[PDB]
Amino acid sequence: IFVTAEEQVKQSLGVSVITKEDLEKLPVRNDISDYVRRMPGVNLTGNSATGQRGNNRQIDIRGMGPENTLILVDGKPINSRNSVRYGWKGERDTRGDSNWVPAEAIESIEVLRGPAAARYGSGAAGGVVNIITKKVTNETHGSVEFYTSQPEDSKEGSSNRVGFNVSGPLIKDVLSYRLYGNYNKTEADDVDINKSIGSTAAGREGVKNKDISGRLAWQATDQQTVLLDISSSKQGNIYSGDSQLNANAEADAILSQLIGKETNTMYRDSYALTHEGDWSWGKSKLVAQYDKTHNKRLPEGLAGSVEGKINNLDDKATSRLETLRFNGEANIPFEYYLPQVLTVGTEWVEDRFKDNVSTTQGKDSSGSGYGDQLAKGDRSKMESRIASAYIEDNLKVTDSTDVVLGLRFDDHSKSGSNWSPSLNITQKLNDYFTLKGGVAKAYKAPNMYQNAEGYLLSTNGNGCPANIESRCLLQGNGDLKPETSVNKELGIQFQKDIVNASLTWFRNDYKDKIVAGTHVVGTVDGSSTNANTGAVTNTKWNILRWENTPKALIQGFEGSLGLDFGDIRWTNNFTYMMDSKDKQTGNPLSLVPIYTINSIFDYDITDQLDVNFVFTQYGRQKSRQFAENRLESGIGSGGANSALKPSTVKSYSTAGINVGYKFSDQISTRVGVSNLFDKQILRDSNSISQTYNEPGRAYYASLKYSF
């Protein structure tokens, strides 16, 4: 049977595929990023290379930053983090969107890196993580699973899960369901975990997850199928003391009270309806989906020494993000000169966003604050629309040569239209080798804060670019161009039986990335009235705006190695990172080790008994190297002492073992330990390299009923 372009590029070098089986052999604590991170060209890093909110690490692909990692679930985009205020330097106080589907509910995970991911449009310049959930089943198969992790160190949080999955027929062979549920609670790290090295940065914040999700599958005709997906999730945090400038939580009037409490809460509801036709001329797929996300959390400083810190014990505000999305698509096999499979498709997406707490700034009772002049109209509501169409061909150019030619057109309501060409070649050399490559141009539309004229922020001086003197404002920009990136990869794939290997060069030229601008587009006079006196004072502000900056360069090598001896097996990879630099600042896009080596080992001792070993090795993580504002350039209010202090985390390694006993056909269980050598790093507030907590030694166990 025929093979579409989409299917074919999942044979690309920059693609890997995790199974339910892998996931079982190496249990996750909560967030799957802890297993996804082990793939070639993948990292776990903060939202920006500044290090702020460093324990908020999420899936990074080839060092392009997590804003550039598009998470999908069964093919449908998640975008809940856009709820969260995106700040002056690219920071967001989110944990991201790789934690919406409980580990035990996952059938498969597809990681697409580089050229193979540009297909999927806005936000895929880094890559795509496609979480594939368990399927409907024509006989009732059940699962219940528990998990616990138990850190040696008293100050690190233990974690606990329970969850179920059940699927069956309601009507044999025409209507069937899948339903899965999960309650996870990972306790926070103590407030004071990082103190023993003079550091005021918080440890990891905890999370209570509540997830429920339902699928109905209906075979309406011999050639027509209808899927319904309804899911709802709630994520409530457990506050560990985090704050953008790493204040001393325990000695802060307010924060000290919020510890161990829920200060932010993330709600997500999602509905999708899908129709799939199986026609004589080929195949078709229509999708409607609607997503509703609320972001409820305590308010915060939005400038100065209080920036990024909680103002208040009580007055929670909520932000509301609705997405409606439609997708239609057809696959037709035909033969003109060569065998082909033409894909042709349409996509429509609209976003509506309410945010009334971030979109207030420079409002003054005189009616002449800086924002009263620059931002008029309802600043609280933002719209985005993308209309897209694409065409794709999978050609057998020879019985040895498989080639994919795609083109994608995108038209965004603010940024304009944009073309994304996409080549992808597979070329057998012989029974054992094969050559592979792709070139693709990825897209990303501005994020809503970056676009929005009603979003204003300020510094008194320190945040200003080193070449400006006093006070700067940063406004959103409706006239931004979209982010574009030409992503190339090329490599060799080897496979005898028992042995396989790849090596692949990758290189992305990332263009017009949207960031805090450095040119003053003009100036404005802003009145600031004294609350109690009515005394006015006018301030000349320099106006900066979000702006696309010309070029960043990413480059490196991925290799992988597989050694299968039946009962004994080894899966290893490495990734070497030759280049991560913006050609203007000289800084890296995203803090990631210069190299990362991974090894997984499996040995089935008996049919029941199993042992499993994991080892990971990280080369050196350098900090940002070059100043981009007054403070960093040694001319802020703190002078030369507050100047940038580049530093680099020294390389290191961690390991883990399991013994995995299947007590029965029905009952499984797995006991193990992680960071076997207690290689434990604490987050240093006085550094811009040591930005995160590497958890120490932890004993964990998981048992699974299967009925």
Q: Which two tokens stand for residue 404?
A: 């994919």
- In the stretch 54-83, what mask flags binding to ligand C8E with x, by CB under 6 A? ------------------------------
State the minimum distance, in angstroms, from the CB of residue 499 to ligand C8E. 10
> Rule CB under 6 A: which of 217-256 touch ligand C8E?
none
Q: Which of 160, 265, 539, 599 binds ligand C8E (CB under 6 A)?
A: 599
Grouping H, G, I as helix, E, B as strand and the rest as coil, residue 298 is: coil
Query: Judged by CB under 6 A, does residue 14 bind ligand C8E?
Result: no
Nearest to 9 by CA among 395, 495, 279, 283: 395
Q: How far is CA 684 from CA 85, 156, 249, 677, 693, in A?
A: 25, 16, 14, 21, 9
Minimum distance, C-beta of residue 653 to ligand C8E, in the bound complex (Å):
7
Other C-beta atoms within 10 Å of 173: how many? 8
- Cα–chain center distance at 40: 16
Report in angstroms how near the CB of residue 562 gets to ligand C8E at its nearest.
9
Least Å distance between CB 503 and ligand C8E? 6
Q: Which of residues 367-426 bind ligand C8E (CB under 6 A)?
A: none
Q: Least distance (Å) from ligand C8E to the CB of residue 624?
A: 29
**Shortest spacing between CB 282 and ligand C8E, in angstroms:** 39
In 3D space, the residue among 687, 695, 689 whose CA is nearest the CA of residue 197 turns out to be 687
Q: Shortest Cβ distance from residue 501 to ligand C8E (Å)?
A: 5
CB nearer to ligand C8E: pick between 610 and 684: 610
In 298-432, beta strands by DSSP E: 317-335, 339-354, 381-396, 401-412, 416-428
- Non-local CB neighbours of 271 within 8 Å, separated by 6+ positions: 229, 230, 289, 290, 291
Residue placing its CB nearer to ligand C8E in the complex, 324 or 503: 503
CA angle 307, 524, 299 (to 5 degrees): 25
Comparison of 449 and 557: residue with beta carbon closer to ligand C8E: 557
**Whose Cβ is closer to ligand C8E: residue 3's or residue 657's?**
657
The site map against ligand C8E for 173-202 (x = CB under 6 A) is ------------------------------
Are the C-beta atoms of residues 118 and 68 closer than 8 Å to each other?
no
Shortest Å, Cβ 495 to ligand C8E: 13
Identify which of residues 100 and 574 has a Cβ nearer to ligand C8E in the complex: 574
Question: Of 80 and 675, which CB lies nearer to ligand C8E in the complex structure?
Answer: 675
What is the closest distance, in whole angstroms, from the C-beta atom of residue 671 to ligand C8E in the complex? 20
Nearer to ligand C8E, 449 or 574 (CB): 574
- The interface with ligand C8E within residues 151-170 (CB under 6 A) comprises none
Sheet with 522-527, edge to edge strand ranges:
456-459, 472-475, 538-545, 522-527
Would you say 528 or 599 has its CB closer to ligand C8E? Answer: 599
Cβ 12 to ligand C8E, closest distance in Å?
Answer: 17
**655 lines the binding site for ligand C8E (CB under 6 A):** yes
Under 8 Å between Cβ of 395 and 419: no
Q: Where do we find the tokens 């996804």?
A: 36
- Cα 42–46–51 angle (5° rounding)? 135
Residue 501 in contact with ligand C8E, rule: CB under 6 A: yes
Give the contact letters, 535-574, x = binds to ligand C8E (CB under 6 A), - = no. Answer: ------------------------xxx--------x-xxx
**Shortest Å distance, C-beta 598 to ligand C8E:** 8
Of 344 and 503, nearer to ligand C8E (C-beta) is 503
Chain centre to alpha carbon of residue 537: 44
341 contacts 315 by C-beta, under 8 angstroms: no
Distance CA 580, CA 140 (A): 50
Quote the least distance from Cβ 557 to ligand C8E, whole Å. 9
What b/e readout covers 537-575, taking b as 16+ CB neighbours within 10 angstroms? eebebbbbbbbbbeebebbbbbbbbbeeeeeebebbbbb
Question: Nearer Cβ to ligand C8E, position 311 or 653?
Answer: 653
For 67, list phi and psi in degrees, rounded to 5. -65, -20
Find the binder of ligand C8E among 183, 601, 603, 626 (CB under 6 A). Answer: 601
Residue 152 near residue 678 (C-beta atoms within 8 A): yes
Size of the site for ligand C8E (CB under 6 A): 12
| Residues pairing with 345 in the sheet | 329, 390
Residue nearer to ligand C8E on the CB measure, 15 or 49? 15
Nearer to ligand C8E, 463 or 559 (CB): 559
Task: Give the CA count within 13 Å in the CB-facing half-sphere of 530.
Answer: 6
Q: How far is the CB of 612 from ligand C8E (least distance, A)?
A: 12
Nearer to ligand C8E (CB atom), residue 501 or residue 701: 501
Which residue's CB is nearer to ligand C8E, number 655 or number 671? Answer: 655
Query: Is residue 657 involved in binding ligand C8E (CB under 6 A)?
Result: no
Spatial distance between the Cα atoms of 190 and 498, rounded to a whole number of angstroms? 47
Site map 609..638 versus ligand C8E, x via CB under 6 A: ------x-----------------------
Instruction: Report whether 175 contacts 663 (CB < 8 A).
Output: no
Q: Least CB distance from residue 606 to ligand C8E, whole Å?
A: 21
- CB burial of 244-259 (b: ≥16 within 10 Å; e: otherwise) equals bebbbbeebeebeebb
Q: Which amino acid is at 364?
A: D
Q: Are 696 and 654 in contact (CB under 8 A)?
A: no
CA-to-CA separations, 531 to 54, 365, 372, 458, 543, in angstroms, rounded: 36, 9, 17, 20, 25
Asked whether position 147 contacts ligand C8E by CB under 6 A, the answer is: no
As a whole number of angstroms, the distance between CA 91 and CA 332 comes to 44
- Applying CB under 6 A, the residues found at the interface with ligand C8E are 501, 559-561, 570, 572-574, 599, 601, 615, 655
